[PDB]
Design a protein around this nucleic acid. Structure first.
Length: 437
RNA sequence: GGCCCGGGGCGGUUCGAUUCCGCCCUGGGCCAGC
């Protein structure tokens, strides 16, 4: 029930078992031969090449080295030809440039084209930098592979493992740099508790300093921040997570939490107890990749949240969920209904010119003075949050992300009441309201 | 696609807008993809 005790039990959940390892080995061997028969110049990279992959995430990464002088077109075409001839099954994928994904003797494989270069400068795509990251990591991580797995298991279990937009957490590469720096999972965790939003971790200089933002400098390029996409709040959840684990080590820190679903009836009662306005904007999920979609759901959610606050509906928090089918932007406000009348600030009494224009507007109520300036009573076009967002979304669809906005323009609706509790959003709502138990 | 910085045009709203809500062109930086 002590740190060392728990970590020994944790390796069991993070380290791949013999069969998963053997399987991976037989795929590597078979893949090596198929490539050598074609006399292809390649290099194995990633967590599989450095035996640092988390149990259950076996995936082999093969990068095809190409002469610096080739056109990007050659790399894709020849790269496609090679992946095609060497994979049991294939499928083109797309990052900054297209590549090939597939299977070999049961395991997931990525056949990626890149330039074989000496010295990081002259890098044309992120994929060119990968081989360099690999060379730097291969000699320094050796011997600490399980410290990397324990760290990965910890972040994954707690929903902040990857660096893609759906997570905004800690990439694999970042985890290995963290181990090379701190020496182990426990040391990483012990020190992370002292991290601030101004921390700068420079692996190459073996230094830690104060910067303007959380910055983990890439050993292979000092101008690159490896944790660039680690969100501020995620950085915060990690720090607090380390403080907790060191205070009461548990195996539950490496185990994914059960969705702990709640019956909608109880949900309704809680929204009743809160006396707030809870609603969602439902529309169709545009057919695009998570990496383009989630940042859009974030913008759309934010723009609307801001509309709600300047409109005085006192928004508490927002959320959002995607599905195969639709997208939901969730909201909770403190004001279910606001009066129709509100007060507008006018000019100071001395301003005769502007006071006159301020009174020229025929209004239903006749303005008044207070503290030296005129004020007017005006009437709102809407008096409820839902009613406000129907207006906002209908006319400001274009500011909600290129795709999400285009979809909301062609269709959207606002759900509330029971009708909401029946949509695939009860989990997001529970996280958004702090529902506990 | 999203984020940061900067140019040139507009619409709306307001007593009053560079200053709030937004739309066109447009220069550079960065992020995810592995």
């Amino acid at each position: 029930m002590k740190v060392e005790e728990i970590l020994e039990k944790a390796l069991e959940l993070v380290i791949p078992d013999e069969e998963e390892v053997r399987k991976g080995r037989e795929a590597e061997e078979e893949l090596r031969r198929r490539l050598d028969e074609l006399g292809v110049e390649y290099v194995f990279v990633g967590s599989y090449a450095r035996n640092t992959w988390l149990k259950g995430s076996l995936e082999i990464d093969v990068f095809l080295l190409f002469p610096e002088e080739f056109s990007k077109e050659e790399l894709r075409e020849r790269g496609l030809e090679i992946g095609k001839a060497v994979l049991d099954s294939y499928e083109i994928r797309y990052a900054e440039h297209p590549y090939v994904h597939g299977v070999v003797k049961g395991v997931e494989v990525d056949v990626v084209p890149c330039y074989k270069l000496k010295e990081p400068k002259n890098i044309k795509s992120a994929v060119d930098r990968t081989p360099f990251h690999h060379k730097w990591l291969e000699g320094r991580i050796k011997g600490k592979e399980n410290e990397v797995r324990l760290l990965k298991g910890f972040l994954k279990a707690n929903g902040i493992y990857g660096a893609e937009y759906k997570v905004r957490g800690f990439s694999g590469y970042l985890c290995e740099l963290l181990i090379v720096f701190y020496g182990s999972f426990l040391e990483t965790v012990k020190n992370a508790r002292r991290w601030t939003r101004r921390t700068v971790i420079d692996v190459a200089k073996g230094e830690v300093r104060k910067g303007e933002e959380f910055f983990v400098v890439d050993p292979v390029d000092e101008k690159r921040n490896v944790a660039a996409n680690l969100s501020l709040d995620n950085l915060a959840r990690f720090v607090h997570l380390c403080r907790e684990f060191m205070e009461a080590p548990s195996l539950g820190f490496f185990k994914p939490k059960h969705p702990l679903e709640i019956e909608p009836e109880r949900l309704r009662k809680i929204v009743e107890e809160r006396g707030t306005a809870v609603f969602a904007v439902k529309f169709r999920k545009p057919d695009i990749v998570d990496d383009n979609l989630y940042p859009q759901l974030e913008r759309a959610s934010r723009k609307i949240f801001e509309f709600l606050e300047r409109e005085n509906f006192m928004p508490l928090r927002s959320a959002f969920k995607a599905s195969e089918e639709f997208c939901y932007l969730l909201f909770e406000c403190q004001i279910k209904e606001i009066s129709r009348v509100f007060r507008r600030m006018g000019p100071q009494f001395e301003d005769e010119r502007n006071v006159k224009k301020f009174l020229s507007r025929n209004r239903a109520f006749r303005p008044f003075i207070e503290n030296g300036r005129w004020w007017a009573f005006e009437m709102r076009k809407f008096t409820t949050p839902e009613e406000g967002v129907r207006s906002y979304a209908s006319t400001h669809w274009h500011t909600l992300g290129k795709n999400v906005g285009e979809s909301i323009r062609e269709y959207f609706e606002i759900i509330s009441g029971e009708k909401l509790f029946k949509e695939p959003v009860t989990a997001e709502l529970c996280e958004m309201m702090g529902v506990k138990d």
